[PDB]
Structures are given as structure tokens and as C-alpha cells.
Design an enzyme around this catalytic site. Structure first.
Site, PDB file in Angstrom:
ATOM      1  CG  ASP A  39       8.108  79.489 -37.304  1.00  0.00           C
ATOM      2  OD1 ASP A  39       9.222  79.780 -37.776  1.00  0.00           O
ATOM      3  OD2 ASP A  39       7.340  78.662 -37.821  1.00  0.00           O
ATOM      4  N   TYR A  51      10.078  81.374 -44.891  1.00  0.00           N
ATOM      5  CA  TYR A  51       8.687  81.697 -44.611  1.00  0.00           C
ATOM      6  C   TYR A  51       8.474  83.114 -44.176  1.00  0.00           C
TER       7      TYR A  51
END
Ligand code: BR
Ligand code: BR
Ligand code: BR
Ligand code: BR
Ligand code: BR
Ligand code: BR
Ligand code: BR
Ligand code: BR
Ligand code: CU
Ligand code: CU
Ligand code: K
Ligand code: K
Ligand code: NA
Ligand code: NA
Lengths: 621, 621
Positions: free
Chosen positions: B290, B374
Site C-alpha cells: 500500500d 481496507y
């Protein structure tokens, strides 16, 4: 009224009367322990019989007794004479503490040791410490206390700053004899004071802290009924108090729709031991069973609003017995309150356009105790999402010694000439499980790594495995942090909507367990502390991991003896005993008064619910 | 003006103008990354030179460039063309994500796969995911995203409830081509909705939660100056923000008497990786970084008062670049506040009669990001006692798949037919250390058990050992929870009053590290995640444990290449890289939106101070 209600002053008075009347409470008698017995398995539908268990000492040397009384009916149910050389000595009496210093003060060997060091006997405080069991034959069956000296320069001085090393005494607190005085040699007594309220040491107090105001304008979200029954955000439980264990949680249950679902029948810290790792003969015998030998409940502090407990606080004031059977209240000994706990759940979804945030909170039940130089806070936490957590907070003043000129492999230097021996603080949480009822089992869950190959061509796969512990002989387990090891308690006869047994998962901190050599006395007496997790079959008389009479008991008692029965624990009424502790190499920052350090464990639902149990939590303002 | 100040909108616009003037930012160019560079070592007295680093993508397929610009001087310092097949593709552009679903909607192979499943293309969302590096030779040098499908029944439906298993497509986002559509067969698409705002699923919302009001009538105890310089309870630091790393802490120092003492020069989360452990070809390629691939800072949420951040909140609103070099503010992207943190220190002394309690508090600096399903919260904490802590909070909606009829060793069942593949969330904290200055070293500290025998006759002794890591080749370390392993960063040239080097001790959570087979692509690409601790010698161009360009980049860069230099780290300018993460076997309780779970680490002073640093804290009201 609930059979789980707190003992009342009146009940303690009634116990006293029953004993006295039966000839069991003469002037040479002392109550070393007194507490209410929990209800027996299957009784809630039978008439209540409030029973109390009492350990009775005799200062004239006669044999002590264990007595069980029924306050409901006003009778003695049982009274057994104890053979302490066999089953262990009774807990130390608060009144026996002052005795060590007084006896030593007139002993010629002791006075000679103080004279050599030019110390005024009037200024020498003596820490009355448990004796344990070592090589001293004459000690078997005698109540012994050992004493280490600390100099107090004036009434408000912190004596811990001035340990007198190289000197130790042993005392028979019944015959009132000094059995030994050991002087291995003179060590300089550290001279710097450790008076943390002295401006010379603190310097100017900071003026930079602005107030934080925590209030609840509509009052707390929990209710308290029947004195100690708590209901809060789906949770139901009863808050007990026992002089040995302290705060005890009963009947922890969660209301899931139209069902009150049991999770834990009884939660307590059933023992805690502080083993010292300094091989000097002055301290090598040193191991304090704070719970089992001293009784942490009896030393619970009164907690001050705004300092000890902050926010909207609801207090319980438990009642205990004094040495003579008189009720004594511990005012504001237990704090209850709810706290914000950050974000509970959050997602901002691109596709649906929905942005969702919910806040978490926890119910806190706590008390704080002081044992000589140590102070420990015990905190139980219930969270909205079903998580249950325990946390111990350790503070106080470190136990001190001289720091040897050549340095030490077992002692830290905290100030010039001032040492702090290495030690651990190890707890045992006894969790009488009731996951959806009493038919439970435990599995050990490890993550499982997989090898690259057929069925896993990219080498990315990973899994886990679960091993059912089926008999007590297989239920003494160790941590394995590297493989993410946890333990799941489930009910094989209660399944969630996905047809899997409901469960709760225990997450340990994986701190080191007892470091002492396996052949040591402490390893035998605190066997529970050598392994992270034990599972036993429930039994009335199996209450503590160290047995009923820890003081001066030879090894083997408690868990090792229970486990030896090798009972079926696969789908049965079972108890989990989790060992967890702090290993303390004291640092300079711990002196002259130590900042709180913490250790604990938690249990999280594991397919206990059919989906998140916090979907009905509303948006915050 | 401080050289560590946040980037301003003007600076970003000026970078745009300098790039345009240099002929480096024509209409086919896009900014894939832009961030301010930290001051060089030893530049404190030199005048301000604000420099920005920029990665420039070209939508026509020409080679991208890495460029450094001096916004102060109006100049391009360096500009180099990148060979992405060798050194890595640039981070994913926000604009490239939507391309995947758009292109697939008209692809005959994709349409046929959807028709086979009776799905309406108009209702099929595609999660556009990083591609990694696998056996597809045609992807080398191309910007690829892979797509997994989810059905969205209506505009506010949570598509994650309806994964379309057995289907995956690969897309070239520059040439606008669907390179592959793989259909391994039809799986039932789970039918239950996961709409956590739907009353039918939530049931009636609780009315039992009473308000908790947290206010500061005199305002906060910290001060903010120069935009982002914080002073609070002896702490000093600068709060930076970078589009890749998110919140970065600079110049963490503690005022001890007259001296401002450095502790950490720069603290950041320099990478995170989320590897999936399901060997299905539909998901066996699934890993994202990420931080390195997506740039977590750019997806930071605006945090709402009373919901995301509770209490007296001071916000920062950092500015970042858009794809064209225009400034864009993340309004209220960073929350700063202090909060009560229970008891700091407490002792009730029998001998002195003094009862002493002090309260703790911590300063909190946080942000929260959302990437796909997420949501990750990043929290830095500073405590009164000198402790520094980081905590990651993971929530959002779990990534789903079908649940295979026969069950699965790599996927959990969350609802009927609905699976959740096992995965990890692993972080790398990069700590550029400066314990009392830059001359630092690291020691690994293990508890040492001792054998009963001569010098340890009672078998109670225990000790510890410290091993200095002298060179990078010996500085790649693993956890050992069982032996209480920690790592101490010290300054061998700065001693406390007891003549010991000042230090800070890193306490890890000892969670499992990367589980993938060491032969896997992910084990090479996320090499840092295979070990708990790395120590390197500081270097300007060593910023991330995965190197500058992670997207579709094989092994060959980052920590394993740095460590090869085998540089002296014994009393030198060093950097600690700590791996820590969550291993997630999803539970039913995680569905339909998951409660926060946490992981982190902390560092405590270890002989840094000459005594407790909190003796000057005043008694609370
Ligand atoms: Br008597
Ligand atoms: Br004296
Ligand atoms: Br509290
Ligand atoms: Br023994
Ligand atoms: Br162009
Ligand atoms: Br459809
Ligand atoms: Br916050
Ligand atoms: Br690779
Ligand atoms: Cu300690
Ligand atoms: Cu996860
Ligand atoms: K009665
Ligand atoms: K300029
Ligand atoms: Na049980
Ligand atoms: Na450094």
C-alpha cells in the site's frame, strides 16, 4: 437476592459469632483468611446457603484450623486441624509484620551487625518477608519470616534508598526467637535519598499540564443492581471481592438477541509470585507469593476520585474481616467506569458512497493494592465487540540492595552504590470457562507454513492447524510466538449459523515464563509459572495454582498435583490457567519511584457470534 | 522558517512551473509521486534549500523520469529517464484504477465469463489491484493492473458481499488493452447482502450508550508553531506528511533540564505489504504494498470531529500534488491531541506515611487512509515517561471470495458461500536513530537462564546478555519471545551519571513475520518482511526497505541490497528497520464490517535519563 452478592458486614459479624460460640475463636486465635464460598454446581434452583471458609491461626503455638461456616443457618459445617509441616503454613498476618523488626531490635547478633555499620537501631526498618523452603531443617513446621534491613533517616524518608546489604535474619514469629543472623560482610549503605516529594529532587513542578475533563452529563451507560450486578452494552456479570484474590468476576455473559450467552463462569488472578534472580545468599531465598502468602485483597487501596480513577466513577466498598473477625470496609476499593476506546470500525466505500465510522468503548473494573514496596493495579476490561481483557499495572518502589563494586550479572545500578536485583512478576489467571455453557474444550492453534510445490506453485499459501487437548496430561502448553500460537476455548455442542462450534480465542503476550533452574525450590513451589497455559477439569477444591497454603509449603502443590489426575477435558467442565509475567531488569528511570509497566492477556470471540455483534451501535454525535 | 515545515500549495505550484519551464511536464505527463526532500546531513547552518523529488509518468508510453527540483532556486537539479523493466514501474496513478472496469466492460472474453454466471455487466464492479511480477513475460515493461469482480446489486450495495470467484483479468492501463481473461469455472456468487447500515441487518440501534464528554476548558497542553512544530510535556518534534509514507515524525527530542536531547531523527512507516495466502490461481498473485505501490498518504481521509477524533483536536491539513502538479489539500487529514493515560506512578509507603499518585497522559498524532476495501489508521504516541509508541489499526471490509464446497485450508467462511482468504498486514517502521546525537549502536538483548550449581546453589539466578551488532552483515535479526529478546539503541559516547551509555529499548510484539515460501516472488519483493529487525548505516538514497520503485518490480533493490555493503554500524549514524504485522484468519465477527485490530511496537528509555523523568509532574486536581 443473588448468591453472588458481596459479603456484608453483618455476614462477617455472624461468622465471628459462630466461631466464638463454638470455642474456635479464643484470645490466642487469629483469622488469617476469611471469604465467602461460591455456590456449588447446580444450586441456583435450591435454597441458598451462604457459606464462609476461614483459616484460624494460634499465636500460642497450637495447631491452626480450616473451618467452614454457614451464616444462613448459623452453624459450623466443618472444622479440621491442620498439620502445617505437611499441608503448608497459613498466610502471613498483617500483625506479624511489625514483629520481625521488634524482635531483632533486641537481638545481640543483630545489634552487633548494626554497630559494625554505625547504624542507629531506632532508624532501621526491617522488611518482614516470606521464608520459602530451603535447607534449614529446624524451620519445618515453624512459622518463619526473614528480614532485610533498610535505613530510614527520618520519619518521612524513603528507606528503600538505603538498603543494608550483607545482612539477613530469620525469625520464628510464634516462639518469638531469632533463629539466625547472617552477616556475610559490610557493604556501604547507599547515601542518596529517594524522596520523590522533595523539591530538591523533583525540581520545580511543571506548570504546563492543562486539565482534561472527562464527564458524563447523563450518567454512565452501565447499571448496578443487587449491589454488584453489572449490565453494560450487552454484557452481564457480577463483581466479587475476596481478600486473597481481590476482584473476581462471576457469570460473564453476553446478550445476543433474545439469549443471555455465558462466556466465563469465574475469572480471577489466582496467584502471583515475585521470584528474585540474585544468587547472593542475602536474597537468594527471596520469592514473594503476593496473592497466596500475603493476600492482595486485604491491602487494596482506597481509590481517590480524580487521581486514581478519572471520569464518572461508580465505587464498590468491599468488606473484609480483621484478625479478630470484625468487619472492616475498604472504602472505594473498587472503581467501575466506562471509557472511550477510539475507533471501533470504519470504512469509506468508493462504490456505495457510504462513509461509516463507529467509536469503541470499554467497561473497566479495577482495584489497586500495595504490598510493601510494590503497588499493583488489576484491571478487567469488557469491550463492545465481545473482547475481554486483563491488565496488571506494576509500580511502587523497586526492591533494592547494594551495587557491588565489581558490577553484577544479576543486579542493576540505579544510583551511586544502589542496586536493584533482577526479578519477575508472574501472574496466573484462572478462567473457569463456560463458552455457551459448561461443555467446553481447548484447542492449540498454530499457523502452518506451506512449501512451494504442487498445489502451491507460487509458494504463497499459508494455513493453520488446531490440536484438541483431550486429557490433562496433554494440557500443559507453552507459548510459540513465532508460529502465532493461541488457544481456543469452544463448545463442541453449540454451533454458530455456519455450523462451526462457537469459541473464544486467548491471545497471550508471550512474555518469558519462570527463569529459575527447573530443580530449584521456586520452580517446584511455583510450578504453574514454568508454563504458559494449563487446562484442568473443574473441581470444587482446586482453587489456586499453588494450592491452599502456599507459605512455607514444599513443592508440587496445586496445578502439578491436579494435572496428575489426567482427567478428560474434551467437551467437559474445564478451567484454563494462563501464566503471564513481567521480567524486570530495573533501569535508572525506575528510580526513585517507578513509572507503571504493564502485562496482560485478552480473549476475542472466534465464531461465537453469527456476524459482527456491533452492527447496532449508533453513529456518534 | 523551519526546513522541516509542511509543503505549501505555493511550493507545489512552483514545482509544477519549474517542471513546465524545463520541458519536463507537457500535456502527456503525469505526476505519479511528488514530495519534499529532508535537509541533507550537516545543513542546519547552511541556508534553506527546499528540494522536491518527483516521479513523472508519460501516458503515451515514453519512458518515465525521476526528477529533483530546487523550488528555492527555480531549477532542475537532476532528471533521469527510467528503464522500468529493470528498476520498477512508477506507483499506480489514481486515474488508472477506473480504467480496468471500463475496458473490461467491452471485452468479449470478460462479457462471456459474466454471461456464463448470469451477471449484468452494468452491476459488476472490478477491484483494480497491483499486479506484482509473475510468469507473464509480456508484462515486463508494461503498466499492468489485475481485476477481480464483485457484484453491486444497487448503488448503495456493498459489493464485497458478492465476490465473483473463478475469474480474473489482466489489463495494460497505458495501451488500454485487456491482456488476459482467465476463467477457471463458475462459482456461486454469495447472495446475502453485507449492508451494515440496513436496519434489517443491524436491527434496532442501541439506545443504551450515554455520552462521554472529553473537553479541555483551558485548551490543549501542546503548542503548535511554524505550522507543524509541536512542543508538549518536554517533547519537541516536527510533524511532516509525505504522499507515499503519510505522517512522518522529524527531530523527536526530549528537553532534559537545560538540554534538548535528540532521540529519533526521523520516524516513518516506510513500507507495508498485504500478502494473500490462498493458492487459487484467481488470487495467488495477490499482494499489495500500500505504501510503495499505492501511496497511502494520498488516500488519507478527512477526519471528523467527535467521530474519528474525540476531544480537543488540533488538525493539520497537508497539501499534496494532483496528477498534473496542481496542489490539493487533504482537509483535516491529521489529528493531534493529548489524552489521559491512567496511572503514571503510585506508591503508598507504610514507613514514611506518604501516599503518592500521579497520572499519565500521551500525545497522539494520527491519520486514517482508505484503499479499496481496507482502512488503516496510523497512530504515533508520546508518553510523559519518555516512551514512544506506534500503533496501526486495521479495519474496513474483508476481501472476499467464494467459500469452496468441501471447505478450505486457506480461506475462512464468513456467511453462506462467502469466503475470506487468509492474508497478513505487515509494516516496516524506519527509525533513523539519533540517541543523544548520531553516534549510535544497536545491541540485541536476551534473557540468560542460569544452571543451578556453584555460584548459584539455589538455582534462582538469571541474567541477560547484550550482543553489539557491529556491521550490516550481522544486523539482520529475528524475534525470540521465549528469551525476552529486545534491541537497545545506545550512544557509546554519551553516558548517564552512572557512567553507562544512554539508550532506548525497542520492544516488539513478536508477531509472525512473512509466511510465504522463501522461493516465492513475494518473499523476494518483500524481503524486509521475512525478518523482524534490520540495521543499516544511514544513506541519503536508502529510503524504503523495498527501494524506490516497487510496482511490478522483482527482487534486486531495497534492504537486501543495502546490507550487502557491510558498513560499520558500531557508533555511527544508523537506521533501524522494524518489521511487524498482523496475520489475519478472518472470523465471522469480521463480517460485514470488521472491528479494529491492532499491532505496533514501542521504545522505552533505558538509562537515557539519570532518574525518572517524571518527578516534576504535579498532583492532579
Ligand atoms: Br485460645
Ligand atoms: Br543511622
Ligand atoms: Br480505573
Ligand atoms: Br521446596
Ligand atoms: Br508531453
Ligand atoms: Br447481476
Ligand atoms: Br486520534
Ligand atoms: Br520477483
Ligand atoms: Cu519489578
Ligand atoms: Cu486483514
Ligand atoms: K443466620
Ligand atoms: K523560487
Ligand atoms: Na468450566
Ligand atoms: Na541515524
Amino acid at each position: 437476592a443473588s448468591p453472588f452478592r458481596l459479603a456484608s458486614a453483618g455476614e462477617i459479624s455472624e461468622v465471628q459469632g459462630i466461631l466464638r460460640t463454638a470455642g474456635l475463636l479464643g484470645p490466642e486465635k487469629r483469622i488469617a483468611y476469611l471469604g465467602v464460598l461460591d455456590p456449588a454446581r447446580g444450586a441456583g434452583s435450591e435454597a441458598e446457603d451462604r457459606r464462609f471458609r476461614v483459616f484460624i491461626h494460634d499465636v500460642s503455638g497450637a495447631r491452626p484450623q480450616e473451618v467452614t461456616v454457614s451464616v444462613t443457618n448459623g452453624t459450623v459445617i466443618s472444622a479440621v486441624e491442620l498439620d502445617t509441616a505437611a499441608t503448608g503454613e497459613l498466610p502471613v498476618l498483617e500483625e506479624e509484620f511489625e514483629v520481625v523488626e521488634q524482635l531483632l531490635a533486641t537481638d545481640e547478633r543483630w545489634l552487633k551487625a548494626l554497630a559494625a555499620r554505625n547504624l542507629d537501631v531506632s532508624k532501621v526498618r526491617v522488611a518482614p518477608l516470606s521464608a520459602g523452603v530451603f535447607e534449614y531443617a529446624e524451620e519445618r513446621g515453624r512459622r518463619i519470616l526473614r528480614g532485610l534491613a533498610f535505613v530510614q533517616d527520618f520519619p518521612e524518608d524513603s528507606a528503600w534508598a538505603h538498603p543494608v546489604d550483607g545482612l539477613v535474619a530469620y525469625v520464628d514469629v510464634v516462639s518469638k526467637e531469632v533463629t539466625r543472623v547472617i552477616d556475610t560482610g559490610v557493604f556501604p549503605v547507599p547515601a542518596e535519598h529517594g524522596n520523590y516529594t522533595d523539591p530538591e529532587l523533583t525540581g520545580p513542578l511543571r506548570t504546563t499540564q492543562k486539565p482534561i475533563s472527562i464527564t458524563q452529563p447523563e450518567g454512565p451507560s452501565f447499571t448496578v443492581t443487587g449491589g454488584n450486578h453489572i449490565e453494560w452494552e450487552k454484557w452481564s456479570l457480577d463483581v466479587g471481592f475476596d481478600v486473597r484474590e481481590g476482584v473476581v468476576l462471576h457469570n460473564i455473559a453476553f446478550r445476543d438477541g433474545d439469549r443471555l450467552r455465558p462466556i466465563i463462569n469465574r475469572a480471577s488472578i489466582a496467584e502471583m509470585v515475585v521470584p528474585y534472580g540474585d544468587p547472593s545468599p542475602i536474597r537468594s531465598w527471596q520469592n514473594y507469593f503476593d496473592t497466596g502468602e500475603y493476600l492482595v485483597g486485604q491491602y487494596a487501596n482506597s481509590l481517590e476520585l480524580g487521581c486514581d480513577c478519572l471520569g464518572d466513577i461508580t465505587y464498590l466498598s468491599p468488606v473484609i474481616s480483621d484478625a479478630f473477625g470484625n468487619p472492616r470496609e475498604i472504602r472505594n476499593g473498587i472503581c467501575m467506569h466506562e471509557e472511550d476506546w477510539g475507533i471501533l470500525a470504519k470504512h469509506s466505500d468508493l462504490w456505495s458512497g457510504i462513509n461509516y465510522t463507529r467509536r469503541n468503548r470499554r467497561m473497566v473494573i479495577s482495584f489497586f493494592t500495595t504490598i510493601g514496596n510494590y503497588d499493583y493495579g488489576f484491571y478487567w476490561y469488557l469491550y463492545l465487540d465481545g473482547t475481554i481483557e486483563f491488565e496488571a499495572k506494576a509500580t511502587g518502589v523497586v526492591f533494592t540492595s547494594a551495587f557491588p563494586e565489581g558490577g553484577s550479572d544479576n543486579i542493576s545500578q540505579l544510583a551511586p552504590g544502589l542496586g536493584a536485583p533482577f526479578h519477575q512478576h508472574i501472574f496466573s489467571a484462572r478462567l473457569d470457562m463456560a463458552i455457551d455453557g459448561f461443555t467446553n474444550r481447548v484447542e492449540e492453534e498454530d499457523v502452518v507454513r506451506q512449501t512451494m510445490g504442487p498445489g502451491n506453485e507460487r509458494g504463497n499459501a499459508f494455513s493453520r492447524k488446531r490440536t484438541v487437548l483431550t486429557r490433562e496430561s496433554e494440557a500443559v502448553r507453552e507459548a510459540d510466538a513465532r508460529t502465532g500460537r493461541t488457544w481456543i476455548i469452544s463448545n463442541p455442542e453449540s454451533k454458530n449459523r455456519l455450523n462451526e462450534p462457537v469459541g473464544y480465542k486467548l491471545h497471550a503476550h508471550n512474555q518469558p515464563t519462570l527463569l529459575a533452574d527447573p530443580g530449584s525450590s521456586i520452580a517446584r513451589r511455583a510450578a504453574f509459572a514454568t508454563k504458559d497455559l494449563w487446562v484442568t477439569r473443574y473441581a470444587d477444591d482446586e482453587r489456586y495454582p499453588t494450592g491452599d497454603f502456599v507459605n512455607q509449603h514444599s513443592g508440587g502443590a496445586g496445578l502439578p498435583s491436579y494435572i496428575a489426575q489426567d482427567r478428560d477435558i474434551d467437551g467437559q467442565d474445564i478451567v484454563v490457567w494462563h501464566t503471564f509475567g513481567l521480567t524486570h531488569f530495573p533501569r535508572v528511570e525506575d528510580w526513585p519511584i517507578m513509572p507503571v509497566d504493564t502485562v496482560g492477556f485478552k480473549l476475542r470471540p472466534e465464531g461465537f457470534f453469527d456476524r459482527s455483534p456491533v452492527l447496532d451501535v449508533p453513529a456518534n454525535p
